Design a protein around this nucleic acid. Structure first.
Lengths: 216, 283, 181, 128
RNA sequence: GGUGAAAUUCUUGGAUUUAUUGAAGACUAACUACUGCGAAAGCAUUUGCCAAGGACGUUUUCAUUAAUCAAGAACGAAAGUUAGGGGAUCGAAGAUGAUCAGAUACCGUCGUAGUCUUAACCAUAAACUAUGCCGACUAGGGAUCGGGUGGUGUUUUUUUAAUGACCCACUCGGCACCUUACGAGAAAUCAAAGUCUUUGGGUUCUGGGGGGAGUAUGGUCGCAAGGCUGAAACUUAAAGGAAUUGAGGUUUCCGUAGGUGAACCUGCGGAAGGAUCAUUA
């Protein structure tokens, strides 16, 4: 009797300048009638989108990016980074029997007041001449690998802000750094930074948003 | 469906009912009819209630031509839903599923019967005949000791029924106290439920649960409601204050270390009065 | 309008798949007309459709369900029967999601499910017209909805600890009751 | 390239099947029809037929509202339960494929615990 | 929601679902294996601190200090008891739904105590490898955990030097596994359940048909629940048992706690004295 779908309008959600495909998609909002504006209702949304749709190539199909929403003007609403996660089937493919699963997590405040938590994963392997079926790692190796992974992660994220952090996370050079750092302790196939997340945020800082955004 | 096939214990059941020739008998669950006809012979009026119309028809066919035909009344329907007529004594040979409530039905009857001969389960008869301090003293034992008096008569074996069941039967005799005690029934039942929710703990540990304190708080609000007094200040809800009130009660009854299964009747009565003077009620 | 489906395969199912690979890619292009790729770099299978093929998205969905049934460990003919019909579904659950059995109890439960030479499981294969495959602890049932429901009821009742004689009698009863309707 | 995207939750429990189409966020939902509102027998709301009927109805509603592409995510009731979608969710996905609607990014999102609290049954399981 | 089919229950003050955020307590999935540790019960997120331990290696020390163990003592699942704590989930007791030959397909919602913890108790389990502990000998093989030895063997160093990982060979100490009988056994089976009618290495505990019965009495311990010790009268001789081949409900139990239709049901923990098929290695 009301049909609010004819009442609602559409908006175009976009990605920051770090990703190549800076157009995300479409959403729908109600009219900005009396005693209820539309700008304040668009400050808590978190979209999620696969990284292959943001980079084009299918090699990033197992990662997904959650983005916040920050500032809307002129039918265009500009976002910011909120987190990165792995798809569940990627974990179910990665975790297999007869190997050791190593996990680490580090909480760091960045150069700006962005307190984050970083999750890193690793697995064991055989180096192409091994008759032994399993190749587990002793707990001393696991503890050393976890310590090196934690110090590498906090060194990478502590001295920088989230912009260069995500522009280094896109080509996943942290995996190369971890593999090169831990190559003399154990082989360690299949390193991934499996999860990042915001924990604590500073003020709005529209100037940093206008520096990051403002393209097209 | 079981049939008492023994023709020897039935005469003892008949003579232990203590029937003078001017009694009114409520003979509940007549069965086949090996027991009813002698009650018709030695009582002036017998009213039996039957749930099977076919068996009631067979029973009223069996009394045709017999001189006690006109002294038998047959009622139909369920026992726990009809209104019983006047009766002096009771004899029950019912299925065991209605054992637990219907004895209380012998309690709540106005002008209650004098004597009843009841055929019950061995476990049920042992629970009814359970002195305090034993391993069988429960809430039901205290209730039947309050509102009645129980006496076992003889054992009934397994091979005395057709078919012979797995359990052993027992015959008990119950008399309602005349007059009944002047304690209020639902308060006593709630007190026994609270203190017999666990047979082996102390009473003070039995008054630490959330639901008992909440229902006592609701009862205290209701008491202050019709007694018209304003509730004073409290840290959380006011029942916490009532907690020390309960604590103070357990300083004169000396029942905070005693246990429900090892306490006699007088301790429970004193404890009920102890909540009665401090304005704590269960219903 | 090309559409792509990525299906990930476990490595322990890789070696049978190749031995059935020549059995599966010709039918997928001769009665279904979907283009197939096996990407061993990512250890997956790409299923793609193009409007130059048959105009049928349900064909792509049927191919995806066929290869998803195959990658769970099902037989080839059962997956072919999934391709030909529109009714077959796959129940998937675990022993621990019914009742927690740990240690030798779980092994005894799995051995009760299979039985001697699998024949008790084969009994369900004769009594429900389903297809049951046992993982290390997961179990999968393929077939019609009421068929997989009754197979699930039988296998769940057997997991709890019921003897195989009771489920034999239940399978005889349900075989008598199902063949007449 | 004028493609409008949304997402679609497929909640496939034991006795029901929920389809839920929204935009890229979870905010401002569009349509939601269950198996219980398409059949009246109190038994076939869990059946795949009712799930396919509900999927067809929600596909017609999604076609008429304007969204022509969906990212579908499927889940069971999850938690300490089966944690794998049943036949109702698969039937709903197949009926969405029968609608001709654009589908991408197949992913399941069933809530898996890290050995959380106890489930129902009490050491003997559900006598099913 | 729920189940074979229903109902109670929440819901146009918006149930269920979707999205963001927060709090509470509990538990550590996948990795997890015929793997590891501990006297057993038992033990699984990261990091730090404290004390402990096995095996290996030693051309280190002392020189019998040892083995088993009445008395006595430490620990001892889960349940249970007395107080303090917060109490999410599950959940004995309880309140309520319909009982429909058939419940084969005996359930639903709310939920106390309990589940978790601190300070005290209790001292039982199918506490099982149903196999006391110490010492020696006796048969073939492949894996695997920890330590050690050798390899002008492999790889990562950015220069192919230490180390780490892998491979090969050997050795000590473990968790087990496959085959066989030198033997053993009544048999199932056993590398000990062997070294025995040809019978002796040391030592502790137990048993001497089944009910009656772990019942009665007495003692001791425990706040209780109950634990340890522990009979007899009467009864069976087609009596109790171990292994193998020739109308309804039907997994069997153990410790513990509570409640009653039909000697049953349910909560916590434990066992098999229960029937491993398909794929890979």
């Amino acid at each position: 009797v009301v049909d609010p779908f004819t009442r609602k309008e559409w908006f175009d959600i976009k990605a920051p300048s770090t990703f190549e495909n800076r157009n995300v998609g479409k959403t729908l909002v109600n009219k900005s009638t009396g005693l209820k504006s539309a700008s304040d209702a668009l400050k808590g949304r978190v979209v999620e989108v696969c990284l292959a749709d943001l980079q084009g190539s299918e090699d990033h199909s197992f990662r997904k990016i959650k983005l916040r929403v920050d500032e809307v003007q002129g039918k265009n609403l500009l976002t910011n980074f909120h987190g990165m996660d792995f798809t569940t089937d990627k974990l179910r493919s990665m975790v297999r029997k007869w190997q050791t699963l190593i996990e680490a997590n580090v909480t760091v405040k960045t150069s700006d007041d962005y307190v984050l938590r970083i999750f890193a994963i690793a697995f064991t392997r055989k180096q192409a001449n091994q008759v032994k079926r399993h190749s587990y790692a002793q707990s001393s190796h696991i503890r050393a690998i976890r310590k090196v992974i934690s110090e590498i992660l906090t060194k990478e994220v502590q001295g920088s802000t989230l912009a260069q952090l995500t522009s280094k996370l896109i080509p996943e050079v942290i995996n190369k750094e971890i593999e090169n750092a831990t190559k003399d302790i154990f082989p360690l196939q299949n390193i991934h930074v499996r999860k990042v997340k915001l924990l604590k945020q500073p003020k709005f800082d529209v100037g940093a948003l206008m520096a990051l955004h403002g393209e097209g | 469906q079981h049939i008492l096939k023994n023709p020897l214990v039935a005469q003892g059941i008949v003579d232990k009912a203590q029937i003078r020739p001017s009694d009114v008998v409520l003979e509940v669950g007549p069965g086949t009819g090996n027991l009813t006809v002698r009650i018709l012979e030695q009582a002036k009026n017998v009213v039996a209630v039957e749930m099977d119309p076919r068996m009631a028809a067979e029973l009223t066919k069996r009394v045709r031509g017999t001189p006690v035909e006109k002294k038998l009344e047959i009622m139909l329907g369920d026992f726990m839903k009809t209104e019983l007529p006047y009766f002096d004594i009771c004899i029950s040979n019912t299925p065991y599923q209605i054992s637990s409530p219907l004895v209380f039905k012998l309690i709540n009857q106005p002008r209650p019967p004098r004597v009843s001969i009841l055929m019950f389960q061995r476990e049920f008869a042992l629970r009814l005949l359970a002195r305090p301090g034993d391993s069988l003293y429960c809430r039901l034992s205290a209730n039947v000791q309050m509102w009645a008096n129980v006496t076992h008569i003889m054992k009934v074996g397994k091979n005395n029924f057709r078919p012979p069941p797995q359990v052993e039967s027992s015959v008990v005799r119950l008399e309602i106290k005349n007059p009944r005690p002047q304690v209020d029934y639902n308060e006593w039942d709630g007190l026994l439920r609270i203190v017999f929710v666990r047979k082996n703990r102390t009473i003070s540990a039995g008054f630490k649960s959330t639901t008992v304190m909440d229902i006592l708080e609701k009862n205290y609000k209701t008491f202050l409601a019709m007694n018209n007094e304003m509730v004073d200040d409290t840290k959380g809800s006011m029942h916490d204050v009532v907690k020390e009130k309960i604590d103070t009660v357990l300083k004169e009854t000396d029942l905070g270390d005693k246990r429900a299964g090892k306490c006699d009747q007088n301790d429970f009565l004193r404890l009920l009065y102890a909540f009665h003077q401090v304005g704590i009620h269960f219903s | 309008k090309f559409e792509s489906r990525k299906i990930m395969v476990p490595p322990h199912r890789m070696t049978p798949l190749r031995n059935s690979w020549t059995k599966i890619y010709p039918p997928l292009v001769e009665h279904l007309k979907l283009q197939v790729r096996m990407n061993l770099k990512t250890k997956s299978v790409e299923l793609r459709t193009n409007p130059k093929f048959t105009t049928d998205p349900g064909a792509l969905q049927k191919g995806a369900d066929f290869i998803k049934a195959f990658t769970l460990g099902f037989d080839l003919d059962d997956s072919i029967a999934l391709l030909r019909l529109d009714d077959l579904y796959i129940e998937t659950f675990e022993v621990k999601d019914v009742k927690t059995l740990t240690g030798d109890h779980l092994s005894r439960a799995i051995g009760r499910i299979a039985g001697k030479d699998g024949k008790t499981k084969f009994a369900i294969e004769n009594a429900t017209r389903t297809r049951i495959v046992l993982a290390d602890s997961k179990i999968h049932i393929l077939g019609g909805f009421t068929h997989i429901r009754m197979a699930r009821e039988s296998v769940v009742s057997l997991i709890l600890g019921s003897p195989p004689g009771k489920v034999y009698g239940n399978l005889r009863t349900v075989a008598s009751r199902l063949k007449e309707r | 390239n004028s493609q409008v995207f949304g997402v679609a939750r497929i909640y496939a429990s034991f006795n029901d099947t929920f389809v839920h189409v929204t935009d890229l966020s979870g905010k401002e939902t569009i349509a939601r029809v269950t198996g219980g509102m398409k059949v009246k027998a109190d038994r076939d709301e869990s059946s795949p037929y009712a799930a396919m009927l509900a999927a067809q109805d929600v596909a017609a509603k999604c076609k008429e509202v304007g969204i022509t592409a969906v990212h579908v995510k499927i889940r069971a009731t999850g938690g300490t339960r089966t944690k794998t979608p049943g036949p109702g969710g698969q039937a709903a996905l197949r009926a969405l494929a029968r609608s001709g609607l654009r589908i991408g990014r197949i992913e399941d999102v069933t809530p898996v615990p890290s050995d959380s609290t106890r489930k129902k049954g009490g050491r003997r399981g559900r006598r099913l």
